[PDB]
Design an enzyme around this catalytic site. Structure first.
Site, short mmCIF file in Angstrom:
data_model
loop_
_atom_site.label_atom_id
_atom_site.label_comp_id
_atom_site.label_asym_id
_atom_site.label_seq_id
_atom_site.Cartn_x
_atom_site.Cartn_y
_atom_site.Cartn_z
N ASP A 25 -13.57 5.01 -19.54
CA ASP A 25 -12.45 5.82 -19.07
C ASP A 25 -12.79 6.88 -18.04
O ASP A 25 -13.19 7.99 -18.39
CB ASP A 25 -11.87 6.52 -20.30
CG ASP A 25 -10.52 7.17 -20.04
OD1 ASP A 25 -10.11 7.24 -18.86
OD2 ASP A 25 -9.92 7.59 -21.05
N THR A 26 -12.59 6.51 -16.76
CA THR A 26 -12.94 7.42 -15.69
C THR A 26 -12.02 8.64 -15.66
O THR A 26 -12.37 9.63 -15.02
CB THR A 26 -12.87 6.76 -14.30
OG1 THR A 26 -11.58 6.19 -14.11
CG2 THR A 26 -13.89 5.63 -14.24
N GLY A 27 -10.89 8.59 -16.33
CA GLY A 27 -10.01 9.75 -16.41
C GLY A 27 -10.31 10.69 -17.55
O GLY A 27 -9.60 11.69 -17.75
C1 LIG Z 1 -6.58 8.38 -23.76
C2 LIG Z 1 -6.46 7.10 -22.96
C3 LIG Z 1 -6.53 5.90 -23.91
C4 LIG Z 1 -5.16 7.06 -22.15
N1 LIG Z 1 -5.01 8.20 -21.27
C5 LIG Z 1 -5.73 8.08 -20.01
C6 LIG Z 1 -6.93 9.04 -20.02
O1 LIG Z 1 -7.83 8.79 -18.95
C7 LIG Z 1 -6.50 10.51 -20.05
C8 LIG Z 1 -5.94 11.00 -18.72
C9 LIG Z 1 -5.62 12.49 -18.76
C10 LIG Z 1 -6.37 13.40 -18.03
C11 LIG Z 1 -6.11 14.77 -18.09
C12 LIG Z 1 -5.05 15.26 -18.85
C13 LIG Z 1 -4.29 14.33 -19.56
C14 LIG Z 1 -4.56 12.98 -19.52
N2 LIG Z 1 -7.70 11.29 -20.36
C15 LIG Z 1 -7.93 12.03 -21.43
O2 LIG Z 1 -7.10 12.19 -22.32
O3 LIG Z 1 -9.16 12.62 -21.43
C16 LIG Z 1 -9.34 13.60 -22.44
C17 LIG Z 1 -10.79 13.49 -22.92
O4 LIG Z 1 -11.54 14.06 -21.83
C18 LIG Z 1 -10.77 15.14 -21.30
O5 LIG Z 1 -10.74 15.09 -19.88
C19 LIG Z 1 -9.47 14.60 -19.49
C20 LIG Z 1 -8.51 15.15 -20.56
C21 LIG Z 1 -9.35 15.00 -21.83
S1 LIG Z 1 -3.47 8.76 -21.10
O6 LIG Z 1 -3.48 9.83 -20.07
O7 LIG Z 1 -3.03 9.21 -22.46
C22 LIG Z 1 -2.44 7.43 -20.62
C23 LIG Z 1 -2.26 7.09 -19.29
C24 LIG Z 1 -1.44 6.02 -18.94
C25 LIG Z 1 -0.81 5.28 -19.93
C26 LIG Z 1 -0.98 5.60 -21.27
C27 LIG Z 1 -1.79 6.68 -21.60
O8 LIG Z 1 -0.25 4.73 -22.03
C28 LIG Z 1 0.30 3.82 -21.17
O9 LIG Z 1 0.00 4.17 -19.87
#
Ligand SMILES: CC(C)CN(C[C@@H](O)[C@H](Cc1ccccc1)NC(=O)O[C@H]1CO[C@H]2OCC[C@H]21)S(=O)(=O)c1ccc2c(c1)OCO2
Ligand SMILES: [Cl-]
Ligand SMILES: [Cl-]
Ligand code: NA
Lengths: 99, 99
Positions: A25-27
């Site tokens: 997960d690059t995000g």
């Molecule tokens: C958790 C995964 C399975 C899904 N997420 C994408 C992530 O990349 C999310 C993307 C994200 C990024 C920032 C804020 C909110 C979401 N990152 C995230 O939650 O990271 C957390 C852990 O490390 C921290 O750094 C980033 C936030 C913390 S998401 O944002 O909930 C998401 C995106 C598109 C989607 C979805 C869910 O369901 C269907 O389409």
């Protein structure tokens, strides 16, 4: 490997002797795993995702194998919907995004 | 390009005639953008992540320019804390994860 994104980039990880599935997960800044037992002390951390913030347990210097690559770093444990490997360990296995 | 993951893989996008910064996110199935207007029909959706679910508007056949690369697909619009380019559009620009 070179992983396309037509499907979720799921890999096998090994932590504490057990195999689990996790999402590259690059995000994600951080690596977050579903409730499990890890050794040592932990510290509190709040992480913010799409639906809000959650409390997790932060374990440092945890040995974890990712897709056959060895890493040792911070693992957060808490109510994440899927195991996620974030940039803190993607950098240790040498992952890059390319297009 | 080849984008390392020492920091967040943010890029500039053009959507709806607007320039925005967005996260290239292999952990995201879908593309989720902060509140904005888009033309055409939409339907409601719930998407879930760490922290729970948010309600979004689902717009289909939206063109986006991602780091200079044109793609079309579904874009979800709602109270996401970060703009996210998900796999539905990363595939179209030929993005891969490499290690
Ligand atoms: C958790 C995964 C399975 C899904 N997420 C994408 C992530 O990349 C999310 C993307 C994200 C990024 C920032 C804020 C909110 C979401 N990152 C995230 O939650 O990271 C957390 C852990 O490390 C921290 O750094 C980033 C936030 C913390 S998401 O944002 O909930 C998401 C995106 C598109 C989607 C979805 C869910 O369901 C269907 O389409
Ligand atoms: Cl606590
Ligand atoms: Cl799509
Ligand atoms: Na449409």
């Amino acid at each position: 490997p070179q992983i396309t994104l037509w499907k979720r980039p799921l890999v096998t990880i090994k932590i504490g002797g057990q195999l689990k599935e996790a999402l590259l997960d690059t995000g994600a800044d951080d690596t977050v795993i579903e409730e499990m037992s890890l050794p040592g002390r932990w510290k509190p951390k709040m992480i913010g995702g799409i639906g809000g913030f959650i409390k997790v347990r932060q374990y440092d210097q945890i040995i974890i194998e990712i897709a056959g690559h060895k890493a040792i770093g911070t693992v957060l444990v808490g109510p994440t919907p899927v195991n996620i490997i974030g940039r803190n360990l993607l950098t240790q296995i040498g992952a890059t995004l390319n297009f």
